[model samples]
Target: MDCSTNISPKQGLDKAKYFSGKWYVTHFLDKDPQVTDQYCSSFTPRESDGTVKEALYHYNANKKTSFYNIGEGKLESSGLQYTAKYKTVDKKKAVLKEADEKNSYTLTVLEADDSSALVHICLREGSKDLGDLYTVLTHQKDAEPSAKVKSAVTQAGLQLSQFVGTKDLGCQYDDQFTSL
Candidate 1:
């Protein structure tokens, strides 16, 4: 119900629209303790419409980066606010609802400011004993991002890492991300 804390809908702060269109991964987090490499995701809009219909990523160095037609999601905006959600490619089901997959995340805008904003896709969260659960849906690799993207990533990282702790996902770094 409450979206903004410091500003009201009448102010310009509420007029901001979350990311929609082309966005690339700049960084990410590794969930598995043994897997040092983190999964990175990039988003592109469909030609027919502005909606995201494709995503690209490299599972790790051993694996080449690839794009998926399997990606589908919506960046919903209502009354000058944004709401984003990601789902499975084939089933189009929420990542958390998938049957076989261990974890997944959808891009979401976490917070915003006068100059920039933060976004994230929470893959998994809970006790680490159950196994680490979390991954980067969007990360920056630009070494540096545009003011808008930078502010967003910083905010996202804060909230994103908040979900990580002893009882949380407790993600760690490693060399690779595959299970085999």
Candidate 2:
């Protein structure tokens, strides 16, 4: 997959707006998903001094299980994008394993506003691509994606209606991990 190589972050998405609040994945499109179980994800991303860090959570809807990860990387010094090395974590946010040098994820901000955003994430482990994920994000669970973000998805050759909406999935999230 191209993994959004042809795209760039939209201008004017400074930290104030881009990192204003935690983000919930209202919908997701996974290309070549490795797992059959649907997942619900949420993360609180922070950037300071050109370093990026975040607590990431994923809930397996079908299995009713949860996973936590801590991600860290250096920023591009020019935009809202980074390739982060991540480690498995527990519910208390303690590391279960150190960062996997061979595994990383590149996150690209397609658009970010006060209440909504769109992003592309490509997860790779060694030479194997795990998935190319496009996520529609909102500040509140079940909140509607902003019109602009929906348009952004379309511009990326996707339709919001085709993505898996998490609201109907009996999803659960780690509020403690994402709370500001």
Candidate 3:
């Protein structure tokens, strides 16, 4: 949500190393129409091209429902920032051209260590004032971020009180749950 941190898309990003594996969503923030949730996503990279799969769950009136979205992402980066032209795809991997423009997103690596990564998600390039989604991700399933990492997250302008942990999201932690 810090407008001062916004920047135009950069170039020369190490796309492969930064996005080649599973990422468990440790936190999320959004204010557009006021919404928030926790989920897990993964990127399967092939050089500059990749596929993404995410599993999101929701609850309403004591009824639980889930949504799965599959998409293709074309990656480009400059230093620590990356922009991906992502489009929804069907089971056939066919790009949903109609949804292309709406799905584009930016990823800026605020911090990354061998075990975890802290990233800023500019959900829409044209709407920076709407607030950004900051995510703390890990290589291990259900791994709790260390206190040091937690402090780094706070320094990045996101509040732990605003986040709902994955354990509370009613997610089925299984590969098949996120298979693209």
RMSD of each: 10.4, 1.6, 5.0
lDDT of 1: 0.34
Q: Which numbered prediction scores highest in TM-score against the true structure?
A: 2
lDDT of 2 at 151: 88
Q: List, residue by residue over 17-42, the lDDT tens digit for candidate 2.
A: 66656899999998774558889999
RMSD of model 2 against the true structure: 1.6
Task: Write the residue-wise lDDT of candidate 1 on 26-92 in tens digits.
Answer: 4443333664433444444242233544432333333433323234444344222222233333222
Give Cα distance to truth, residue 117, candidate 2, Å: 0.5
Ranking of candidates on lDDT, top first: 2, 3, 1
lDDT of prediction 2: 0.86
lDDT of each: 0.34, 0.86, 0.52
TM-score of every candidate relative to the true structure = 0.40, 0.93, 0.64
For model 3, state the Cα shift of residue 159 in Å.
3.2
